[PDB]
Write a structure and sequence with these properties.
This is part of a larger assembly, with chains A (51 residues), B (150 residues), C (55 residues) and D (117 residues).
Chain A: no helix or strand
Chain B: H1 34-38, H2 43-48, E1 71-72, E2 87-88, H3 117-124, H4 134-137, H5 142-145
Antiparallel strand pairs in B: 1-2
Chain D: E1 8-13, E2 18-24, E3 28-34, H1 48-58, E4 69-75, H2 80-90, E5 94-100
Parallel strand pairs in D: 1-4, 4-5
Antiparallel strand pairs in D: 1-2, 2-3
Classes of the chains: A little secondary structure (51), B mainly alpha (150), C mainly alpha (55), D alpha/beta (117).
Chain B binds 3 RNA strands through residues 74-75, 77-84, 134, 138, 141-142, 145-146.
PDB class: ribosome
Keywords: cryo-EM refinement, tRNA, translocation intermediate, ribosome
Entry title: E. coli 70S-fMetVal-tRNAVal-tRNAfMet complex in classic post-translocation state (post1)
RNA sequence: AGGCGGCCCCCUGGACGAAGACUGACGCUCAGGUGCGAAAGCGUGGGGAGCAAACAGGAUUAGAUACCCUGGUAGUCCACGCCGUAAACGAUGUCGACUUGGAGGUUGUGCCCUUGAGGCGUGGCUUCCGGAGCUAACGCGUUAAGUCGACCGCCUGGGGA
RNA sequence: ACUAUGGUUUUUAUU
RNA sequence: CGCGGGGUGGAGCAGCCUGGUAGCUCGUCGGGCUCAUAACCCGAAGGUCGUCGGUUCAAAUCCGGCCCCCGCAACCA
């Protein structure tokens, strides 16, 4: 269940800039990626946000 | 686009003592004739006291409270945007709109003698029937019948 | 080669929601992961483990 | 009519709608509402507010039957499955328990997503 | 090749490995001839929940015999038969010797009575980049479109077809 | 991604 | 030659084991609002409760006449 922590939240998270409500989305393809741009986060996987 | 102009303000005028009395050289002023509007400042409020005399602490307590704005409406285009988006107005509008946003009869059949007119508009904003009712009270039902998005 | 009648270690490879821990988070290679999945399907038919988290 | 003051709420949520039924624990219905029958069509019934109007509309069917403290039975994948309950609490109701009772078919019929193109 | 995934049992092919043994050049290539079918079609007999060629009704539009949308038969699966055709596509016919490197998976086999999601030598499977070479250009690059050999089935500008 | 929709314009000096 | 359900702004229909609220709503007419038409949303115009009685200040809600409608040669001797 949800977060297993104290208090009933469970609140929305954003992990990307210019992506949500306005100016989005997916400014990371064709081809981009990029391996260096998020520094150490790209050394573990290429999928993290939806898988 | 990128315009960020500094906001206009008015100072209380020492002849009338308040900021609420300092705008009647602009509210109901026409053709740039500013001293022609000065001709009837604050004596129009003594003429309002000829129709309901209750002193200056009660002179606007319903003649603005009954008519002041509370919501801003219209849509915002984000897909399927065939609805309206109501938002509550900021305190910088608490004394505004109600003496400017309607001229539907004043420019069509006049609005009676000019030196008696602000004493009529401050009495009509406390009578609240016929003219200027629909443009005010429509947003007290629109914001309850079209509120499913924001 | 991996048993389905014992669950005392097999329990490590599944969540409280019944999902199997993904192949690149187990890091155990295919011969283990495929035999662990067979053991989970059998331990579920043998009533030692539940299926999904629905009443 | 006399107040009965007990019951179970049966909630169903889809990608575009939210459905509510109130029953006595004998299994017997006393009121219904949907986010569509709340006076909304198109995707206007998909809103988090149409899920609130459905809760207040089903509460309008039991207002003389006096039910305010109940337990919930939840079906279906739709995001309204919590938006109707967080609103039901703000409408003056007491919630005791929430149980997800969604079934799990062993296939049978092909999933309605199709496409197949 | 097409294709192959609920689970259990009866009958059992294909692939691959280690050591010991055997035949006796039996080795490579291939229209018709002999077998093998995805899906639908089809004779005979069943079955009908879901979905849906056909068929309507309601909408969309200038129009809508189509899209949308509510329904709906055949078809789906199964038993015995017929139908050899598909992007059956990693579009590259089959067999064979050989040429720099860097890396990701699958699986035999001997040994240690083993920090392990082990490991090494050797066999098989299956893959990504890229050097030299090859190409009009994409791209191919040891499972090469390289070096080309031994053969086979096709081809000869387009309209018509 | 962020509303489900909107068809026609004679061959023609000719660069 | 005789019966009882219905009759409520132009149509359809509730109102009725409390006797007064004129109602649900379709159409008609006019505005907000989306790309745009309709949906949506804000509103407007028009009722001799068939038609007269009983009991009454009072009857859509109960009754009785008179009339029309109703599956139907009401009987035509």
């Amino acid at each position: 269940i949800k977060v297993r922590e104290n208090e009933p939240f469970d609140v929305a998270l954003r992990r990307f800039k210019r992506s949500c409500e306005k100016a989005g989305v997916l400014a990371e393809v064709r081809r981009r990626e990029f391996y260096e741009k998020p520094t150490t986060e790209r050394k573990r996987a290429k999928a993290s946000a939806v898988k | 686009r990128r315009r960020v102009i500094g906001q206009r303000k008015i100072l209380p005028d020492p002849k009338f003592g308040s900021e609420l009395l300092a705008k009647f050289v602009n509210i109901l002023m026409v053709d740039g004739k500013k001293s022609t509007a000065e001709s009837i400042v604050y004596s129009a409020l003594e003429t309002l006291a000829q129709r309901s005399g209750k002193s200056e602490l009660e002179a606007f307590e319903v003649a603005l409270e009954n008519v002041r704005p509370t919501v801003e409406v219209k849509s915002r285009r984000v897909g399927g945007s065939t609805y309206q988006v109501p938002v509550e107005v900021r305190p910088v509008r608490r004394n505004a709109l109600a003496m400017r946003w309607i001229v539907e009869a004043a420019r069509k059949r006049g609005d009676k003698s000019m030196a008696l007119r602000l004493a009529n508009e401050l009495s009509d904003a406390a009578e609240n029937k016929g003219t200027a009712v629909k443009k005010r009270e429509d947003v007290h039902r629109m914001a309850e019948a079209n509120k499913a998005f924001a | 080669e991996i048993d389905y009648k014992d669950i005392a270690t097999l329990k490590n490879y599944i969540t409280e929601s019944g999902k199997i821990v993904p192949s690149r988070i187990t890091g155990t290679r295919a011969k283990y992961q495929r035999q662990l999945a067979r053991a989970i399907k059998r331990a579920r038919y043998l009533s030692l483990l539940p299926y999904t988290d629905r009443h | 009519r006399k107040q009965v003051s007990d019951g179970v709420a049966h909630i169903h949520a889809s990608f575009n709608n939210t459905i509510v039924t109130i029953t006595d624990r004998q299994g017997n219905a006393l009121g219904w509402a949907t986010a569509g029958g709340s006076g909304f069509r198109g995707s206007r019934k998909s809103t988090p507010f149409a899920a609130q109007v459905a809760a207040e509309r089903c509460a309008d069917a039991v207002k003389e039957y006096g039910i305010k403290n109940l337990e919930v039975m939840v079906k279906g994948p739709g995001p309204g499955r919590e938006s109707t309950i967080r609103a039901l609490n703000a409408a003056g109701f007491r919630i005791t328990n929430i149980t997800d009772v969604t079934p799990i078919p062993h296939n049978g019929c092909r999933p309605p997503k199709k496409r197949r193109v």
